[PDB]
Amino acid sequence: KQASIPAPGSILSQPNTEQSPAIVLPFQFEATTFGTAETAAQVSLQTADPITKLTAPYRHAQIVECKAILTPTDLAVSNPLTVYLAWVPANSPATPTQILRVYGGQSFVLGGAISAAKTIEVPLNLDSVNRMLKDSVTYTDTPKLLAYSRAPTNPSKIPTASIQISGRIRLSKPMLIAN
Amino acid sequence: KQASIPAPGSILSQPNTEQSPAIVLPFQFEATTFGTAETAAQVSLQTADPITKLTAPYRHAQIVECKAILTPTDLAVSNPLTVYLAWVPANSPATPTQILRVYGGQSFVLGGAISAAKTIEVPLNLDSVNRMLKDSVTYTDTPKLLAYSRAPTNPSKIPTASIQISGRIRLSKPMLIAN
Amino acid sequence: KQASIPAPGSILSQPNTEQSPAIVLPFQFEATTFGTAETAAQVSLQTADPITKLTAPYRHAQIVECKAILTPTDLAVSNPLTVYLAWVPANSPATPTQILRVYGGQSFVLGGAISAAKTIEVPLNLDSVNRMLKDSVTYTDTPKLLAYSRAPTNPSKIPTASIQISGRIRLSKPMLIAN
Amino acid sequence: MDSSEVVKVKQASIPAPGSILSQPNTEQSPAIVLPFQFEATTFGTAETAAQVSLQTADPITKLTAPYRHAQIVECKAILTPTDLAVSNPLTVYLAWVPANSPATPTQILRVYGGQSFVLGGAISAAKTIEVPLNLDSVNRMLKDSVTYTDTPKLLAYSRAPTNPSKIPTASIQISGRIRLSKPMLIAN
Amino acid sequence: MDSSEVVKVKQASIPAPGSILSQPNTEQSPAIVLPFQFEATTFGTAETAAQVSLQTADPITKLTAPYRHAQIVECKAILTPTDLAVSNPLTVYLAWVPANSPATPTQILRVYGGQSFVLGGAISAAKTIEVPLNLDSVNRMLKDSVTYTDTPKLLAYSRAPTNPSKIPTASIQISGRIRLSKPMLIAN
Amino acid sequence: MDSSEVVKVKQASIPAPGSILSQPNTEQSPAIVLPFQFEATTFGTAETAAQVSLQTADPITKLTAPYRHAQIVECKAILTPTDLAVSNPLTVYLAWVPANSPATPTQILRVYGGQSFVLGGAISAAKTIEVPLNLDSVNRMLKDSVTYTDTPKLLAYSRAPTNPSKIPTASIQISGRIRLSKPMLIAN
């Protein structure tokens, strides 16, 4: 009844290396936006500063859930824009232009065209990439989103979208950073 | 068969302190609106006058359900506006500007952009805050919604939205107020 | 414990001919588009270059899932267009004009008329065609989509839609192509 | 026969762990072990007689930021001398006390477990010294739904250096591990 | 963290204790184990005829008053060599004698127990000594209906240094706990 | 022949190890436990931002090449005070961190493990310290089909001496053994 009720209680996880119980740390950010410029950036769900800014204190991490929504700002109503999306590992020559031609090809508009409430909400199939966001090894099959818009005559400066990739991820095995 | 069919029948609840069976008292109000001004207020699901105007007669209370919908008034059709939303405890430096960058980041438009029927409906995860709306102690991890809009050239006075936080909450343990 | 844990492990499929375990190879492409021309093409889910460009290395293949979505480009907002869709085998005199009159008849608009997020998403009932995309025999009851739009005064060159038929398909029995 | 270059020292204390606000119902969620170590304060530079609180120590908190619940597990108050300590001795007056102890750094001495450490000179072989944060004379928790006192506060002190130096003659680099659990949301 | 570590030195074993008053029947009041530590003496600033008797030890007595049954749990005297003693050694004398023993700080060496100590200068003389008052010799009791004679008296000595340093070359303190009971009927 | 003898000091226990690649079936190649020891760093001639990672440790790597499966058996870092340090003491910092931990030699003290050491000057500071890399933290593996991230990185530091002595006032080396296997298909 002293210090054993119940003494232990270790129910750690194991994505690729059995380590202490990883805590599901969620995140939200826009690796790339599209509004007043030829949108065409290829960001990965691994090199992203935000993710790397939370997985550094540890050694290994495995994304348990990831998404990508498009939030059309107050603009786009008078200056619409077609945002292209698609999920694919770091590998594969899947270029922004090759979008739509690759499984998971998405394409919507902004303004009077259904784009506001309920958001776009584009989940990422873990069966299409790798969960190991960071490990002792170097995985090349890591998640990676694609985006394109071209942006016609919309020199309104302020972006018309946001394109944020959220989700949660577990991380274990300390890395003893600065502190 | 007199006064015992079935004599007792006490099935009280227990959020943090076993007390008499709390009654689920629902509520609906707009802690803050956004239409013709730089919307940027940080209201909490604890200090709100309405809630405190119903939890006063008691001592402890635990929110069993909370939400936040945006109802675009007759306006916003000619003067749209982007309403930002996000749920987070009283703690965390999550500022209105930090919105979207925090888990649960929302952002929709008004007018021709999907915003009318079905409402926005943004529930609050109890696993992100604290149920104890009010207790003998002082909880800092209490729910708190965020809002932003900036509001461009929309000096139509009348608000374009409402942003109301509804939901239900149980309260027990009398507080013997004025009467 | 050497090379038998568990030695075999053959769990192949069988659509019409028992062969090695077929791998579900997904695909995405627009057999035909509609924007600035009298849209009226009858493409089949068998003769399509893309499909035939992935089923060639094999002998037999059976579509396990197929779809057809319409992604309205940045245009169509000022120059809307009605896209007609319908699924039907290679047989049947189901012509583009006969659309809507045939089971599975679809018809939507573009622009201010619900057409952007969530996409159209028009699945194909395997109980209406044949799974055998390619086999030792010649099937005539193979899937086939229909499209029509007419296209009024929309000489904007760039298409207003895309009409892409995605889905997955299993293929077995090598065909020993060039390499 | 052998050799050890580190001296440990317990801070006498009387049991006094404060009241901890409980777990929800049906226990808790996953948790992580998070070691940390930080330069608490230095001496030799000037009369560096200050104090530190774990409940607010930047390096600690940094690791605490993402969680809204985290009880300390182990904590070491360590004193590490530099070559300078040899040429010019520095005395540190350590003491671990809860947020409620009115104790000023100077008072160190008259506070039960306060200690005095010479360090350097020549008499001294001069080595590392650890003084254990007696977690039971404090509220183990640092960031929790309910904020409070009794939280871990380190004392330590030193008078004006006979002969100063822009390099610490010595420095207390406290450490430990925290049981971080339950998310803070924020992120960014 | 454990090399020159212990340094707790014991004093001559007076086989004898000290009888006190009796305790009556009925139930007994509650008890509080309140700890204490107070600066007792300096050293090295002048010739110090150190002789403290906890019996009238302001700091501890600042705990006694509110109750009328003070009983020393145990305690010890700390010899804290100052940064000064390192370079400026000194011979500290020390003793635990009952408040009746006609022993002046000076006669320490002469009384069965005389603790001889030298701080700084010589190797490891940097280290601090903890000398225990193993109750038996005095009255485990400290305050009640009667005042006793066998209260403990910590006495120590050192003559004036060549340089009665601006501040102490050393330090001595008295630390222990007290079982406080029989609350004082009082005003509020 | 055994007085100041041991002097092997341990570093902060990262409870964690480091996952590596898997091994296939069939029989495995032979193994050779080839030992190694190579001068890693100097000290005392200037400000030394010492940080070696065995992963690219020339000397050990001079053993790797002929085989394609290098696995560190274990190893340690030696702190060898030079005749110079005796009279010219110095504060050596030291740490064993995985090749990913963003820790610069300087931040050693800040990273959970920071080894503080002083050579010469003070008593017995003459002696040599052996600090072990208790595998668990990094990859017990060192070379194969893939290059890993959790390779060990020995890092240490000391600022420039008043006299950046002609030669080192100290010395550091890395010693251990390696299980070499999977001979490299090669030319002769």
Tell me: cis bond preceding A89? Omega within 30 of 0 counts. Answer: no
Is D80 in Cβ contact with F116 (below 8 Å)? yes
How many whole angstroms separate alpha carbon D80 and alpha carbon C46? Answer: 77
Note the resolution in Å, 1 decimal: 3.8
Chain C interface disruption, residue of A114, A127, A146, most C CBs within 10 A: A114
Closest CB from B91, B102, B140 relative to D188: B102
Cβ count near B130 (within 10 Å): 25
Residues of D in contact with E124 (CB under 8 A): 123-125
Tokens 């310290």 sit on residue: F129
Is F123 in Cβ contact with D122 (below 8 Å)? yes
Residues B56/B65, Cβ–Cβ less than 8 Å:
no
How many whole angstroms separate alpha carbon B89 and alpha carbon B46? Answer: 10
The contact set of E with D (CB < 8 A) is: 1-5, 33, 35-39, 59, 78, 80-83, 86-87, 120-128, 167, 171, 173, 175, 177
Residues E173/E40, Cβ–Cβ less than 8 Å:
yes
What domains are defined for chain A? 1-179 (2.60.120.20)
Phi, psi dihedral angles at E14 (to 5 degrees): -75, 115
Q: What distances in angstroms separate CA D172 from CA B56, D65, D155, E170, F10, one per listed residue?
A: 49, 24, 10, 22, 19
Extract the tokens encoding A51: 């993710």
* Cα torsion through A37, A43, A48, A51, rounded to 10: 120
Residues C174/C60, Cβ–Cβ less than 8 Å:
no
Residues C168/C23, Cβ–Cβ less than 8 Å:
no
**Residue among A166, A163, A167, A145 nearest A70 (CA):** A163
Residues C24/C172, Cβ–Cβ less than 8 Å:
no
Half-sphere exposure of C133 (CA within 13 A, CB side): 29
How many whole angstroms separate alpha carbon F14 and alpha carbon A59? Answer: 11
**Residue among D175, D174, D172, D170 nearest D81 (CA):** D170
Is there an interface between F and A (3+ Cβ pairs < 8 A)? Answer: yes
Q: Is A144 left (phi over 0), alpha (psi -120 to 50) or beta?
A: beta
Extract the tokens encoding C151: 């296209």
Phi, psi dihedral angles at B51 (to 5 degrees): -55, -50
Q: What distances in angstroms separate CA E174 from CA B156, E37, E76, E84, E142, one per listed residue?
A: 77, 6, 6, 21, 15
CB pairs < 8 Å spanning A and C: 67
CA distance A152 to chain D (A): 32
Residues D152/D51, Cβ–Cβ less than 8 Å:
no
Residues of B in contact with D145 (CB under 8 A): 130, 132, 139-141
How many whole angstroms separate alpha carbon C70 and alpha carbon A121? Answer: 18
Angle at F122 between CA F120 and CA F127, to 5 degrees: 45
CA distance D74 to chain E (A): 16
CA distance D137 to chain B (A): 22
Q: What distances in angstroms separate CA C41 from CA C33, C67, C71, C86, D127, one per listed residue?
A: 9, 17, 17, 12, 87
Cβ count near D143 (within 10 Å): 24
Order across the sheet with C144-148: list the strands.
C42-44, C144-148, C83-87, C106-108
How many whole angstroms separate alpha carbon F36 and alpha carbon F48? Answer: 23
Cβ count near F114 (within 10 Å): 23
Half-sphere exposure of F147 (CA within 13 A, CB side): 6
Closest CB from C74, C111, C164 relative to A100: C164
Q: What distances in angstroms separate CA B127 from CA B120, B169, E45, E90, one per listed residue?
A: 21, 16, 64, 65
Residues D109/D116, Cβ–Cβ less than 8 Å:
yes
What burial class does residue E140 get, using C-beta atoms within 10 Å of its C-beta: 0-12 exposed, 13-18 middle, 19+ buried?
middle
What burial class does residue B5 get, using C-beta atoms within 10 Å of its C-beta: 0-12 exposed, 13-18 middle, 19+ buried?
exposed
Instruction: Report helix, strand or coil for F171.
Output: coil
How many whole angstroms separate alpha carbon E53 and alpha carbon E40? Answer: 10
Is A114 in Cβ contact with C114 (below 8 Å)? yes
Is there an interface between B and D (3+ Cβ pairs < 8 A)? Answer: yes
Closest CB from D35, D183, D188 relative to A174: D35
Residues D183/A27, Cβ–Cβ less than 8 Å:
no
Length of chain A: 179
Closest CB from D21, D184, D188 relative to B91: D184
Is F148 in Cβ contact with A176 (below 8 Å)? no
Residues of A in contact with D37 (CB under 8 A): 179
Is there an interface between C and D (3+ Cβ pairs < 8 A)? Answer: no
What is the b/e burial string over B66-84, where b = at least 16 CB atoms within 10 angstroms of the residue's CB? bbbbbbbeebbeebbbbbb
Is A59 in Cβ contact with F16 (below 8 Å)? yes
CA distance B80 to chain A (A): 7
How many whole angstroms separate alpha carbon F45 and alpha carbon A2? Answer: 57
**Residue among F26, F143, F148, D72 nearest A17 (CA):** F148
Residues F110/D78, Cβ–Cβ less than 8 Å:
no
Residues D36/D180, Cβ–Cβ less than 8 Å:
no
Show Cβ contacts of residue E180 under 8 Å, excluding neighbours closer than 6 positions.
E31, E32, E34, E63, E64, E66, E67, E69, E70, E71
**Residue among B25, B33, B77 nearest B52 (CA):** B25
Tokens 């375990």 sit on residue: C21
Is D32 in Cβ contact with A20 (below 8 Å)? yes
Show Cβ contacts of residue E35 under 8 Å, excluding neighbours closer than 6 positions.
D12, D13, D14, D112, E175, E176, E177, E178
How many whole angstroms separate alpha carbon F82 and alpha carbon F104? Answer: 25
Phi, psi dihedral angles at D110 (to 5 degrees): -80, 40
Angle at C94 between CA C93 and CA C97, to 5 degrees: 120
Method by which the coordinates were obtained: X-ray
